[PDB]
């Protein structure tokens, strides 16, 4: 998970970084400057994680590419309402125990933390109204509320 400037005083231990909503991992930290957009960084991360899926189990194999496509839409400014909620549901349902191995929880940890902290960039990605239906001529659509 991404951590902020306030977490920089944490000792590099398993328990302290775990208590802050992240994990110590390899203890090889990566610093992100203000010139880096979080949506592009998380799009790059999820592109790696989705193409490094082993293809065995459904949530990683088929929901990491969905997060990749949502992040590409948000990076191009073509986001639509419900995208952030879809990302959060993907983060919740790819957690520990839902997938066969631990690749997908590690994949959704940065997406979780980036939405948690830098949410304004993700909401800045949303610029289009939601649509996945085109009009069929003789059929009046069911206008859901």
């Amino acid at each position: 998970d991404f951590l902020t400037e306030a977490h920089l005083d944490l000792p590099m231990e398993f328990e302290s970084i775990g208590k802050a909503g992240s994990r110590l991992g390899t203890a090889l930290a990566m610093a992100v400057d203000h010139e880096i957009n979080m949506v592009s960084l998380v799009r790059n991360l999820e592109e790696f994680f989705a193409r490094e899926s082993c293809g065995w189990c459904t949530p990683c194999r088929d929901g990491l590419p969905w997060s990749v496509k949502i992040l590409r839409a948000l990076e191009r400014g073509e986001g639509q309402p419900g995208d952030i909620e879809t990302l959060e549901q993907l983060c919740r349902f790819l957690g520990p125990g839902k997938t066969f191995c631990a690749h997908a929880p590690g994949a959704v940890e940065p997406l979780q933390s980036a939405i948690k902290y830098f949410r304004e960039e993700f909401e800045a990605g949303i610029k289009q109204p939601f649509s996945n239906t085109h009009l069929i001529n003789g059929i009046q659509p069911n206008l859901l509320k």
Partner: protein
């Protein structure tokens, strides 16, 4: 044309039967109240409704009360085949027990469908051969094997291309 078992007056008799038709409308079911004489005087029986087994004998009795010549129009899916009621208490079609001259699909048909039935029956009588008297001539009826209304209207029906879309009144 083919028929299934001195000439001008035969056509005059056919014309007199054609433009003078007295119907006996049988109620039966919903087809009657959509489409709205003694059976001795009537010469056309219009059966419009379900042939329930309890009153198929009534239909057959009031058909046998009519006199020669007698024609039958069957209105609606029930009278045609049993329709949507293929069930224990329903006879599957009028033509199971009395002969039918014109069949009209619909559930119910429109009143104008009944009027078109009247036209179809009118040329059906208009080119049929019936005996002049009980002692002179051949005592057999000859119904004309007409071209089917779906074969005649095939080209104009197939030539239809576009219809109004269903989002309007």
């Amino acid at each position: 044309m083919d028929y299934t078992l001195m000439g001008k007056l035969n056509d005059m008799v056919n014309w007199g039967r054609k433009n003078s038709i007295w119907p006996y409308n049988f109620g039966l079911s919903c087809c009657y109240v959509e489409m709205v004489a003694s059976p001795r005087q009537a010469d056309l029986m219009v059966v419009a409704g379900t042939c329930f087994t309890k009153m198929a004998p009534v239909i057959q009795r009031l058909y046998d009360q009519m006199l020669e010549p007698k024609w039958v129009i069957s209105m609606g899916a029930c009278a045609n085949s049993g329709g949507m009621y293929d069930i224990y208490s329903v006879v599957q079609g009028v033509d199971k027990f009395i002969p039918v001259d014109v069949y009209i699909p619909g559930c119910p048909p429109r009143p104008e469908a009944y009027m078109q039935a009247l036209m179809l029956l009118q040329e059906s009588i208009g080119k049929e051969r019936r005996p002049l008297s009980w002692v002179v001539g051949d005592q057999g009826v000859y119904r004309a094997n007409m071209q089917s209304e779906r074969e005649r209207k095939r080209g104009e029906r197939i030539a239809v291309t576009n219809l109004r879309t269903p989002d309007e009144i």
